[PDB]
Amino acid sequence: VLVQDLLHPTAASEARKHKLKTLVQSPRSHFLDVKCPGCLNITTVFSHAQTAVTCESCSTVLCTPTGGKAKLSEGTSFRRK
């Protein structure tokens, strides 16, 4: 220790360090573009979703709330937004 770039830490250090503890607070979450096999509509779902979000066209609930990230419905296809 005794010398660091608190302005320029290694990106690995930032990734492992807790959020609100980095040089600038940066959320670890993101959004998801999710395709339900029911209808071809693509919906945006927050990673740590909270409500049992269903498709607007049909009752095909996509993400399930829990302590951590919303657990998906085993059938839908997701990409990171």
Partner 1 sequence: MGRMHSKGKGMSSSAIPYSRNAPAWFKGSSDGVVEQIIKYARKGLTPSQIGVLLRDAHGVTQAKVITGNKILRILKSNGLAPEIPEDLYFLIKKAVSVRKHLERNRKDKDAKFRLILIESRIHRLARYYRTVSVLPPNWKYESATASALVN
Partner RNA sequence: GGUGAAAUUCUUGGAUUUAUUGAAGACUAACUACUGCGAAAGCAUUUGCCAAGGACGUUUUCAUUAAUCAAGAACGAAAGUUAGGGGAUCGAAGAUGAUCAGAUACCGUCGUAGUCUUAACCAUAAACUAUGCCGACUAGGGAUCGGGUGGUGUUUUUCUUAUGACCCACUCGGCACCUUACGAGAAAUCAAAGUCUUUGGGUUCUGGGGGGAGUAUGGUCGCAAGGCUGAAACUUAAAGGAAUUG
Partner RNA sequence: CUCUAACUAUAAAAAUCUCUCUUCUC
Question: Binding site residues, as ranges?
Answer: 36, 39, 55-58, 60
Please say which residue, 2 or 16, places its beta carbon nearer to partner 1: 16
| Best CA proximity match to 41, nearest among 58, 26, 29 | 58
- 58 close to 52: Cβ distance less than 8 angstroms: no
Torsion of CA 72, 75, 77, 81, to 10 degrees: -20
Please say which residue, 22 or 54, places its beta carbon nearer to RNA: 22
Residue 72 interaction partner, one of RNA, Zn ion, partner 1, none, beta carbon < 5-8 Å per kind: none
The residue ranges that bind RNA (CB under 7 A) are 1, 16-19, 21, 27-31, 46, 48, 50, 66-69, 74
